[PDB]
Amino acid sequence: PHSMRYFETAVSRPGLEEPRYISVGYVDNKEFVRFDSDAENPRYEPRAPWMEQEGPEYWERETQKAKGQEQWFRVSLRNLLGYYNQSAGGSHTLQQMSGCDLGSDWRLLRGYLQFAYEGRDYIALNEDLKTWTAADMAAQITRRKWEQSGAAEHYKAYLEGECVEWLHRYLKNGNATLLRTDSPKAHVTHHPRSKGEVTLRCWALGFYPADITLTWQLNGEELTQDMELVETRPAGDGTFQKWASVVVPLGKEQNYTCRVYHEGLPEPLTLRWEP
């Protein structure tokens, strides 16, 4: 399964008439392009080594499309102020998600387009890419305005044509980097916890892609209801980390085994504390 997304954000700030506009491109969750209006020279830039394959004309046009986006987000933010009868003394946020998933069959699986106001659902394009979903009464004004204008037709054309097209391109170009795995470098550590109880940390480091699964076992039974599991975190080098800990009775640690599941791991790993 493969995807491309564009996460967009405009933030109106107290006093500044211009909103800050930030646009990030993702290809299979990997950031590949970025645009921040707060940069000294706001232009779309490569964020993945395979994007270097694109020429000045690609970057020139993207940047121009972005300045056009900047203006769309500003007026929208202004129109949104009136809909919810808000005072123009504070800051507000208008976010957008758009893109396309591809199935195991590199054919299209689904189009995506959804908006938000103040971090809350506003309006979204239905999967049929024809009808709109509003979240509240204010949204309905955009719904009725958009249904008429044929907006959905335009978004459909992008989400079924250009989204697909360039994703297929990015997938061929960034193949060597995108379809790679780094299997985890798991290990178990040992620490105190309470009176006559130690804790067992099962780490998994330096792994790509982000998806992973860590399990703990007592007497051949998974310890689901008794397991401290941190959310997955980036290392800052493109790989990811996760650990999982249980609280075990002291002197009975060897009873416990840690298991790791990753798509770069043909056989899942099995680990235990090593005194």
């Binding site: 993207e62 056009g68 769309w72 907006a151 335009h154 250009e162 097209e165």
Partner: peptide, 9 residues
């Protein structure tokens, strides 16, 4: 490739 919004909110 980036997308451009056709109609205002």
């Amino acid at each position: 490739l980036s997308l451009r919004n056709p109609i205002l909110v």
